[PDB]
Amino acid sequence: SSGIEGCTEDEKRDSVVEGATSVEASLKEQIDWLAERYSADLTNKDTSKWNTDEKVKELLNEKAVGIESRLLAIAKEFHKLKSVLCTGVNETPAHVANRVSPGDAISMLYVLSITHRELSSLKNKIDEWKKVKASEDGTKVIQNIKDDRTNTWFVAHGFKVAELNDVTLEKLATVVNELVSHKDMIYINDAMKQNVDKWTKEESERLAMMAEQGISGAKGKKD
Question: CB count, 10 Å around CB of 164?
């Protein structure tokens, strides 16, 4: 009755939420990617003797013999675990990867090393709340993964509630402790650790070399 009143709205949308490509994924996607690689069929590729295992035998020591087989075996081990740790995940994939390219390996080696880094952090964190009991703060015993303290670590690391499967904290503790101390796992992880360290020192050498020795020409990106 006071005036002409309808609905005062703006006709434009200022905020255009663009697809932000996440530089460095979270731990949830990281470990899931590890599982994804193992759960990816790449039979569309005729793998006519990929010398990945031979190349890494020269670059990552002779202990890297049959690297892809090791990679998918360790990823399978993690898939076995992720199927228990993630909701709706089956313990046996249908699409199983057989080949890892040198280009994939660089991502895989950095992923696997991250995975063991989070798992070692996970066991350290879960031990804290395993040590938590009924406290004066109104704290309940942390028995579930969807418990306050557990959930807080998981959410921060990228684990969305729907992603994480509800198991007991103390069972999880047991499973993460045996995996972090898994002989073959540590063996491949520390070997990767060496390679990734060597590659990063090599990267920095190349960086210095291109800055000091080289001269950046007309480059952009190769396909």
Answer: 19
**How many domains, in total, are found in the chain?**
1
Question: What is the 8-class DSSP label of residue 88?
Answer: T
Q: What distances in angstroms separate CA 7 from CA 4, 10, 12, 54, one per listed residue?
A: 10, 10, 15, 70
Q: What is the CATH number of the domain that holds 131?
A: 1.20.910.20
Give yes or no for a contact between 123 and 111, defined as CB atoms under 8 angstroms apart.
no
Token digits of residue 3: 């005036």
Does residue 19 fall inside a structural domain?
Answer: no
| DSSP, res 141 | P
Structural tokens at position 168: 């007991």
- Count of residues in the chain: 223
Please give the Cα distance from 164 to 191 (Å, whole number): 29
Closest CA to 112 of 42, 185, 161, 54: 185
